[PDB]
Amino acid sequence: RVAENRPGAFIKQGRKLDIDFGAEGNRYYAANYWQFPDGIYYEGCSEANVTKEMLVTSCVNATQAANQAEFSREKQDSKLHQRVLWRLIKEICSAKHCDFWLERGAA
Structure with a gap:
């Protein structure tokens, strides 16, 4: 398989979400x-x-x-798009969670 499905690659289902980006971004x-x-x-x-x-x-x-x-x-003209897009990328990145995560302990 070609390296198009590389770690970081977008998954565009086209589904509308619910996120508060801010007035303009919303x-x-x-x-x-x-x-x-x-x-x-x-x-x-x-x-x-x-x-x-x-x-x-x-x-x-x-x-x-x-x-x-x-x-x-996008960036060089689509300034608002970048802001909104990054806020959503962060939402996705925050959402994906590891099963093994536990309460670690150290001195």
């Missing part, structure tokens, strides 16, 4: 949700030493690396 998303990813192909989970803060940050970084063309094309 209107923008409501009118343009078809363009956006509904999910993201990323699997940060490996072992209990990996934390949520680590995973969410790494997911954003993976998403950047995977979908460079999308961001590059």
